[PDB]
């Protein structure tokens, strides 16, 4: 196995499958990786790392600070309101903004640090009852209050499809999120939504074809 060659294969897939390869970022899902393996990922020339537990990313952030390594940290898991304080100063993008109360806490902590936190709105497109993401109706109801949080920068949307081998279902899920982004860009965001965070190790080639700009790939990189 070779981390470099795994990364290189994914970048080829991006060129092959994306309707706009220049927009697509690889998010290495490092949630099960040691700092040694993460360092090997950085040595490929990539440096976007996504984590999903606050305590874990907290400790990895400090580690790579002390080793003076440059990383763009993404938070891609469930973010409890009272844990925002631990990542607000070092995470570059929060993918999982699923409700107004969380957006309001992120905004409040960002303003206290005199910064604007980039976020994605997490949307439950397939409608599971292990739901955390927005329904579209809930998001529409929240929109103006979200757009008035001046220390948030809402740059896109995110979904997680259920695991399946049915390509028709995956395309339905990924295309529906894209339709939502396009609609939100006409009605509310003046085309300022640029990002679509969708796709994981077992389906990212489909996600790329449906316009993903962040693929969250762990297994394919590290195993």
Numbering used by the authors: 1 to 223
From the paper:
The electron density map showed a clear electron density for all of the amino acid residues from Met1 to Lys223 in the A chain and C chain, while in the B chain of FnYggS, most amino acid residues from Met1 to Lys223 showed a clear electron density, except for Glu128-Gln132. The crystal structure of FnYggS-SeMet did not exhibit the electron density considered to represent the PLP molecule, consistent with our spectroscopy experiments showing the absence of PLP binding in FnYggS-SeMet. Instead, a sulfate ion was observed in the PLP-binding site of FnYggS. This sulfate ion was coordinated by the hydroxyl oxygen atom of Ser201 (2.7 Å), the nitrogen atom of Ser201 (3.0 Å), the nitrogen atom of Gly218 (2.8 Å), and the nitrogen atom of Thr219 (2.9 Å). Interestingly, the position of the sulfate ion in FnYggS-SeMet was almost the same as that of the phosphate group of PLP in the EcYggS structure. This result indicates that the sulfate ion in FnYggS-SeMet is positioned to provide the binding moiety, as is the phosphate group in PLP.
Here, we report a functional and structural analysis of YggS from Fusobacterium nucleatum (FnYggS). Although FnYggS exhibited low (<35%) amino acid sequence similarity with previously studied YggS proteins, its overall structure and PLP-binding site were highly conserved.
